[PDB]
């Protein structure tokens, strides 16, 4: 019924079905995005669908490569949280999905990447509207993915959003009670 | 329709005189609240400013420091600013009556996607609650910071002047999205 309600049914979906949804569920998520406000009203996003099975893989390859180095390397906080949630390097959503959302921000556009971002926002909740799922997949190294796809120089590479019907995710993470002030600190 | 809710919602720089109720701020940041975020670190921390003196501070630090960015400004810049005839007043930052203040957790993995992802999230939820907010974006986050004595572990984002919608200004216009498909 709620705003909250939606945004908080939605959770990260990692396991997909092979079965497409219509594009025009996935464009519906754009249109709803593109709607968000941004600096100078610059619409600094760029979308990039990536639906060939070939590309993909390349994409998922140089994903996990750049993962497991990734892992051999994390220390900290990060480290700690993926390790008690036994996250790896392995990246088989990369292939399953039916759609790899490649989200761009336009480089030159004022406050390009907090707008692009808020605009996810969005994206993301629409995309729970219409029954898909998915996951704000940031690898650590996004250079050899924007190079994969021929990126021009004027974008940069913000997020790779795997789409697809969900296939009994797991549960949602807790969340801590929202931190408000007044004032001052 | 969230497509509706999306569409409908433009920025408010003008506002009623009288103050919502804090409950639909908080609802909103409840929804933000509820939004992913890198390593689940939910690195967003809110602080909602009503005071009157202190709205006065952050207004007039604000305005100082556009007076300088649009003595200076450019180019497209300068172009789009002028043709929207915005300048360096904002007495939103006054007459709001709360300034909602989003910062990132500095440490938190992935905070500023993060905190700007879950931006989406609370000016959609102001929009449902009827509430207006424009995302104002201080040419000097530091000397806002001081302001509220912003501990060093945090970034202020933005600064979101909240409150009943008093804004004829139509919203502006969206392009169509263009996809491009596999590679450019
Ligand atoms: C990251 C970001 C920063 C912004 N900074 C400012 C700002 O400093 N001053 C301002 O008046 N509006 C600011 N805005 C609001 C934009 O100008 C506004 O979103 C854009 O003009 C589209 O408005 P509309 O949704 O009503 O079409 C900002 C918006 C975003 C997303
Ligand atoms: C900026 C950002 C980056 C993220 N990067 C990754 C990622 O690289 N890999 C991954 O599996 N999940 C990634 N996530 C998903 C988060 O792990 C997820 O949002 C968090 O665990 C909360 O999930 P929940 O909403 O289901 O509770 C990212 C989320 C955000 C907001
Ligand atoms: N911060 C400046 C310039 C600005 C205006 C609108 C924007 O969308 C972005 C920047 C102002 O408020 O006038
Ligand atoms: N990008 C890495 C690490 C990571 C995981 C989840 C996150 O929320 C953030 C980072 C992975 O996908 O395994
Ligand atoms: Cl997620
Ligand atoms: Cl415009
Ligand atoms: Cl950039
Ligand atoms: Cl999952
Ligand atoms: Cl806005
Ligand atoms: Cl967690």
Redesign the pocket.
Known sequence: KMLYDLAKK?????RFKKEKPPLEDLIYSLKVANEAPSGMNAQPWRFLIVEDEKLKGQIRRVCERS?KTFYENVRGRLKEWLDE?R?TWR?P?LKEAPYLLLVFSEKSAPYSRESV?LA?GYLLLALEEKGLGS?????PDFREVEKLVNTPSELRLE?ILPVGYPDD???????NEVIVRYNTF
Do not use: A, I, L
């Open positions: 939605r959770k990260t979906v990692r993962e949630k996250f990246k959503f971002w996810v996951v704000p997949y940031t690898p997020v995710p797991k549960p949602k993470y807790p969340r």
